[PDB]
Amino acid sequence: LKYDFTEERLKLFDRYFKYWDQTYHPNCVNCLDDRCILHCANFNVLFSTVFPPTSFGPLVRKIFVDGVPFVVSTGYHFRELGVVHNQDVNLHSSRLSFKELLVYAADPAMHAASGNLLLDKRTTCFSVAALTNNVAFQTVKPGNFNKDFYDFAVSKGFFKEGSSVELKHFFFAQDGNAAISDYDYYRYNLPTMCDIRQLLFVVEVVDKYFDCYDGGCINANQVIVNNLDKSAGFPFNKWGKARLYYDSMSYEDQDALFAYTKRNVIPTITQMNLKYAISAKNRARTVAGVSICSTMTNRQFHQKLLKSIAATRGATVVIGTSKFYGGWHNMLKTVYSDVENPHLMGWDYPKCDRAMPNMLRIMASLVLARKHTTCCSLSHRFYRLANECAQVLSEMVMCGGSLYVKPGGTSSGDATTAYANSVFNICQAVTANVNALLSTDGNKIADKYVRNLQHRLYECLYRNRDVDTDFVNEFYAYLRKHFSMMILSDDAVVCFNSTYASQGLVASIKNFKSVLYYQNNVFMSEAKCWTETDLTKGPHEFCSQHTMLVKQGDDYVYLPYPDPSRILGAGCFVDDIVKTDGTLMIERFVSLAIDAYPLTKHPNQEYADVFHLYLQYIRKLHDELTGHMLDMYSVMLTNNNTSRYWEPEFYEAMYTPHT
Amino acid sequence: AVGACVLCNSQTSLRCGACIRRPFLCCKCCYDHVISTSHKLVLSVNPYVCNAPGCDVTDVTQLYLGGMSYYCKSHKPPISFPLCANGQVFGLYKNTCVGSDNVTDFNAIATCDWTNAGDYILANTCTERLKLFAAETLKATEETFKLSYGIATVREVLSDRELHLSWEVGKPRPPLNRNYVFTGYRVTKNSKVQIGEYTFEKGDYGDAVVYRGTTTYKLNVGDYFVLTSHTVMPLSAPTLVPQEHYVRITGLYPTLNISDEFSSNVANYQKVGMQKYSTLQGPPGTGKSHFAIGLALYYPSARIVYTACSHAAVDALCEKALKYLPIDKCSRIIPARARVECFDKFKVNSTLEQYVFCTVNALPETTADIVVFDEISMATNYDLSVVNARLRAKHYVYIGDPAQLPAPRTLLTKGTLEPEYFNSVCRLMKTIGPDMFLGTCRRCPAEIVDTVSALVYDNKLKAHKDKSAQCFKMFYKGVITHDVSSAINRPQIGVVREFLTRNPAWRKAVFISPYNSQNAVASKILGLPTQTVDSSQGSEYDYVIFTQTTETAHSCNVNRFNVAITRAKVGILCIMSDRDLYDKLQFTSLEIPRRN
Amino acid sequence: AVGACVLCNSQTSLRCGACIRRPFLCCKCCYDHVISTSHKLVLSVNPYVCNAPGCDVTDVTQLYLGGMSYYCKSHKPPISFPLCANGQVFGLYKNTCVGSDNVTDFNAIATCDWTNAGDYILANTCTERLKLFAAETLKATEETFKLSYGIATVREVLSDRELHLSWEVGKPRPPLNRNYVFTGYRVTKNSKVQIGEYTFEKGDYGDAVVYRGTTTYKLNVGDYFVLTSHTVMPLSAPTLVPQEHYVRITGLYPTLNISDEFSSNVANYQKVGMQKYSTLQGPPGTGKSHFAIGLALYYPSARIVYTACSHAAVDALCEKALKYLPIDKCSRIIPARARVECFDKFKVNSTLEQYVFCTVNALPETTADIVVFDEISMATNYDLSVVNARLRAKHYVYIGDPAQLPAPRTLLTKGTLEPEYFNSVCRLMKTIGPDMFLGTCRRCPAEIVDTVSALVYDNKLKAHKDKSAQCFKMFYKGVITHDVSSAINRPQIGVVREFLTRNPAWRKAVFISPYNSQNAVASKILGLPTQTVDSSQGSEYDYVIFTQTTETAHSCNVNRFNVAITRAKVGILCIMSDRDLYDKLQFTSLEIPRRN
Amino acid sequence: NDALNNIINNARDGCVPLNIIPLTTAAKLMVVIPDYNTYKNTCDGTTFTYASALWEIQQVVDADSKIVQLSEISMDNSPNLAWPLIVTALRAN
RNA sequence: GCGGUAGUAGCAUGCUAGGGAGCAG
RNA sequence: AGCUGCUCCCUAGCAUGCUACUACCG
RNA sequence: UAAAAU
Ligand SMILES: [Zn+2]
Ligand SMILES: [Zn+2]
Ligand SMILES: [Zn+2]
Ligand SMILES: [Zn+2]
Ligand SMILES: [Zn+2]
Ligand SMILES: [Zn+2]
Ligand SMILES: [Zn+2]
């Protein structure tokens, strides 16, 4: 029954960390700034490995309403944040309005306690409960085949043995032990205590990376939800999609609820789902649908900053910037800036979404939140952070028909994924820079300036205890002058000086290796990190596109061409009515060809043949379409204007800087 | 939010917010109600107000359709046209609306006060929808009149039944009635926590009142008692289903020949299976209830519900019932209320045994083959429709004599309501008959029924063992010395001073009197216990002395008097001025200054 | 909403809404059906009328498509197209349809009223799809005619089931038969309310009539009864799956030496498995049924389904099966119908058992190895397509005798059908050859066999077993006590009384009657369980009784007579007035006082 | 159930961690088993213990959700079943 | 013969909304 | 049965803008 | 004027 455990943590601290000259707070609620939140949650991570794992999560309590007993959560015990009690609980009420109905529906407490005990041996993940008398298994049907197009492609000489291009992407099927055997992958998530002193500075540098934006709380009447019809999490998927809910609430219910989370905590329930789309590796891929209750708020709390990021060019982040109309060239040019001996490189984090230790997720949430300097108070921000963590870190996953606990890692589909992952990425990069720089024979560095830099760096890192600004600024400039980074949500490209990198003055790759090892619990074989010496050919690969330098008229421009096999596969395999009898679906092929235009300018042969193939196929499509429509009635249409679709120039327009 | 017109049943989306209940009026019907009354506010999906802020004009007749809103004449935009026109109002389906011309009585109801007889007379004489609306309305009026009360301050906590509760000033104190069940609170400082419910009543002396609580949470000098309040729910089912006849019984399994002492009842029992429902005229303690239990026996393989409204009634029913019944029974009444103790037999919530016994507001959505309800002289049409809404049995039956006393319906002040209109089924039984008359008596002596059948009955019910010493010592009433409002008849009790000792064998009686302070001042000059008609319904005191109050009909309330007679085993004394009433209770005519 | 041309199977979107059943038509076909017939209204994705309000020119040949919409001659837009143009009618795929020459006989079908064998004689000889459509519209016309009957009301109630009814003056009154059902409406003012389904039957006199009801409702006087109509689904399966062969038996597996009593037929058993389907002609119930069950035995693991049209037929068959089969058998026969009771053994609905028996119209939609239709000499091509649609198996076997009794198909009243044209397989038997045949009686006394072979057969049978106790009192026909035109002759039983007692052991026989109501009255002055000649054709008996109505055409029908007299094993007797047939029958007639 | 109320009253405050509610107070347990050896090392036999309590086995189904008896669960008959079984057991007193 | 107020149809821009489809993480 | 981001296509609507010719006053 | 339908 015991769940407090405070003087125990203090006792441990005293028995070991006796002279760690800084006050420790067993409950972050009692923290000062944020940096105190970090320096306390860090220790909490280490200490929470000792206590029973059946003593974390929601902290429920019996209440009464209209002379009736309920069980609802009134707090939480975070293995990194200690105890937290809801601030506005009310015993004994008469009736229930809408928002309170909701917050008592989206909670696991009443759900779980009304469930039958579960113990599964399929997973080492700590199960919790089941809601039925029969676990469910979901499969993944195989894709449907489009023949006539395949026969066509054959007829024009493709797919002959020994050809360069062939079919490699398909619709893999999955049996019944898929969902759980996938979800189990969280066994790669470990409780890791990240070094705190250097973190307290890498976080400063990362912050400096985000100076040119702006955000804050926004009023409910100002949010924007593109596509109002997505699944509504659990159990709201038992009624309808989002629009139903986003409608039945006033512009104040949303405001009341938002302002309610700023002082209380709301657990949630996440669902797993099996993505159904082409790929190239048979291991299935899944997605986490979050409850409406968390999104409906995180929107109001972040969308301002988000939109502020999604519309800015030339930034180190590049999200939202479209590659068409030569934009891609702008990105690749600005990421060159002016590095003295430019080399290019890229890497990739194996199982990036599972392996992320909790500390870094919290660090990312903090860096995002730091913009709320005024749209909130200061306990408000902490409660917001708490609700966030409790909703997208150790919440109760609802897999199959049973509730398990998610030990950590990023929920694949929260409100703030893509940005969070990017922040994490930059954090890792900076950490690697710091490690490599400190870790070299200071008595051998020749450029006196750099030597002084390294010395004062160590000094500011271990000795001084309060933030310095000037050194932070100088260092940020140094990095932007010798390490230039184009970032996406985990997918990176780094243009860096070679000469320094030789003398270990910027991180090479082995630095990345050691960093992922000792701070992310995984190992990154150099079988996927790619390097590059000749800029005239662009980076090896980025967002699954290759880059090619083509003469567009008078000048030369970088263009992204995809991977042909992917395009062909998208042509050949679909979901029933789609493409099958594609004489009604031309636009599919229009867009596809759009994606496959640059293959025209390619040195190797079959590539451009792919383009011409798509063209001629479109033409035959429209032709045999009109032929049928004529017989169906007796007069063809008046004005189709579809002929433009099979002339090359129209596609070319999609890559030229004037729109 | 959308529904059918309460009068013409047209699908509509209008509500006369000036009407308390906000019913659904068709377009034409709404137009009529508003052009006819002072009901000058109409609601649809939205209220109809000049949306121009500051202009608090509400009525439709001066509102104009704005670009997409509503505005007053002064505030109406250039293109703005009024709402009410063509005898119709802008409302949905305004093409298919039909309306009707019965806005007259509907209006009268939307305007009545429920304080007088004619209101109710109209009520139990109109169309079904109008009847239900009237019930809703009068119940809401009673609700707000209840809300007119207030809290109190506790002087002391004398005992578990003796309490010192002074009422908050500037408020009509809620009197001493079981009906006054109060939500008690123990103010920590802080702590809007209900410690339970506690109700109060006049014991054996004042001003120390008696109080019973659903929980024995002992009070102190610091609690405060709010009046329990809530909202009336609307109703859907009619008062009763239309009657149906059958050439046989539908799924009823008659018993072969067990306990044929109810044989004269079986001749009636099968009749039940032939009719969708029926009714019953009978004095209490007679085949009253007895018949119903013998019936449940007669079909021992059928789900049956027994209901009342009074917990006293459900105890008078459930006991005597478990007697001839396996146990193996169901009477699962109260989950977490009941100011007093209730059923004592089984479980609260799984609708198990084929025979359940409960109270109206406790009956959930359950089914049976037959539902039975006594007490019909007391419940309201509201209550009947509630019954229909909570039960879906295949048969129904109604038991009771309008000779008893009905619901308090406190608002009555000018005039009295006839049993002719207590409610629907009663209006029928008194306008067409019960279709079954019930006899005869069991407990009481004959002389207390042979003369008392000369009054409400037509010398119909019969009993025996007329002894002993049941007389009418009709004493011409003394002067009016009433301490509180209700009458102090101490000179009338001055007939028993010379008799508290003249009855050594009759030291086992119980005082009765209509006015409760006539029970009080008697409790002052007491030597023998008291018990008024209020907490009656299913018991008998051996001896009793009927003590009459003021010549006002509050004393000889032939219903109240009669029921005060029917609850006796041996003897009675009747003491009233009595110019004519004593010509209906024929006993040894006795006087007071003379002892014979 | 497209389809195939009923004559060309081409794509189209038209239906001669003037023709009853709305069949799809190609362009040219539609043009020809419309140009040569009063049939004019054509329906497409929309109706074809002038969209200008008021113009009701519905002869399509006058109409013009305007802008998107259709228009008359006058209200036509300035620009348009004439619809009925160039020997065609404009519809989808107009330029693709082929058209053909089956239009004449087509219109002949669509325009007949099924009154003279000619339209039949063509109905049974057109193309298969056309045949289908023909059967559809036939059954539809039957249903529509059924509506023509009058309406009935109640006049006064007599008992629970004894009643006096009132018929519509001047309207056809349908007969009292278990194959009729009436929805009961009673009307309050208002409240024309259905009360339930009620069949009827004549009581002991007029107009006391019995009735079986759906519920135990009480009856009134403001009540009435409407015979309930019916609908007709469209069909799409052919009548006969294309005939085939194979080189070796597949699907089914013989035993070894089991049951030699079925010896010679094994030859037929192989070739049956060797074809896709086949037929067998056999005099009454001899090898018929016998051979079917024998084959069923022959291939054990073979899942087999029996089915026919006559309930008594499938019943006799299921009992004959019970005589020899594992049980391990069911007759999944009748849901909430079975006005006449039937099967007594097993379930009605699991479709697990290997040997499933049922009636055609109540069949499920299932598969099996083989299926054996029975009594094709009575069914219509309609039912054949029905069974080919609901079921689906490998080997089919049809059995019957084109000298038996066909479908009544009452509507025809002018001329007579050659048996050859009862339906498809009837032709098949009569045309090319019955593929397999059987010629010997195993069920009947030799004397009646001689008589029949002397009659409708060409002296082409043999059997066993002769005497005795057979006669043909040519007793004059007494009063035709015909209730409705359905015949009754009580003085015919006026001599049954003389064999109601003289009968030494002829007490367990079955009686047979040309008419249903004279059969019912036989059940009144009862002698034994009786039946109708139609409800026969399936069982044999030692003794059988037969009295006839007058010499009406239905009565003197030679085929009815044959199938009647051929239901007996050792004793038989038939009583017609008889001007000629007793000259053909070979027994020992007597006189009214001569009965031993 | 009253035992829930009971353990509530045992709290120094009236708030208890969620995870231990069903662990102690559920009335029926469901266990999911992959492979035979694993089954042997748990709910082998007709009753077993778990979470300091005694559970009794009754009614055992398969992936296809068809009933199976304990007899069939041999070592060598196992390669004949939809083999991640569901076992539902009851709280034995 | 010009200028201001009323129509028409056309054109251009844009903004919203609605709907379909594809790619990247 | 997710979170975003870009892109194409179709449709409606509003308003603008503009065009001109048709009607009133200057 | 003879059979006879989730
Ligand atoms: Zn701290
Ligand atoms: Zn904020
Ligand atoms: Zn109305
Ligand atoms: Zn106004
Ligand atoms: Zn026609
Ligand atoms: Zn045709
Ligand atoms: Zn016209």
Author numbering:
A (entry chain A): 271 to 929
B (entry chain F), C (entry chain E): 1 to 596
D (entry chain B): 100 to 192
The authors write:
Cryo-EM grids were prepared, and preliminary screening revealed ideal particle density with good dispersity. After collecting and processing 4107 micrograph movies, we identified two major classes of mini RTC and reconstructed their structures to the resolution of 2.98 Å (form 1, 83,144 particles (75.6% of total particles)) and 3.84 Å (form 2, 26,768 particles (24.4% of total particles)). Although the overall architectures of two mini RTCs are generally similar, the conformations of nsp13-1 have a distinct shift. In the alignment of two forms of mini RTC, nsp7–nsp8–nsp12 and nsp13-2 present a r.m.s.d of 0.429 Å for 1905 Cα atoms, suggesting their highly similar conformations. However, nsp13-1 in form 1 mini RTC has a ~10 Å movement towards nsp13-2, compared with they are in form 2 mini RTC. In mini RTC, nsp13 molecules have three major contacting regions (regions 1, 2, and 3) and two minor regions (regions 4 and 5) with nsp7–nsp8–nsp12 or with each other. Region 1 includes the interaction between nsp13-1 1B domain and nsp12 Interface; region 2 includes the interaction between nsp13-1 ZBD domain and nsp8-1 helical domain; region 3 includes the 1B interaction between nsp13-1 and nsp13-2; region 4 includes one main chain hydrogen bond interaction between nsp13-2 ZBD and nsp8-2; region 5 includes a faint hydrophobic contact between nsp13-2 1A and nsp12. The movement of nsp13-1 results in distinct variations on its interaction with other components in region 1 and 3, and minor difference in region 2; whereas, the interactions in region 4 and region 5 are identical in two forms of mini RTC. In contrast in form 2 mini RTC, nsp13-1H320 and nsp13-1Q194 move away from the interface domain of nsp12, losing the two hydrogen bonds in region. And in region 3, nsp13-1E244 and nsp13-1R248 in nsp13-1 1B domain also lost their interactions with nsp13-2Y217 and nsp13-2T216 of nsp13-2 1B domain. For note, because the resolution of form 1 mini RTC is better than that of form 2, we can build six nucleosides of the 5′ extension of RNA template in nsp13-2 in form 1 mini RTC, but only build five nucleosides in nsp13-2 in form 2; nevertheless, the bound 5′ extensions of RNA template in nsp13-2 in two forms are in similar conformation.
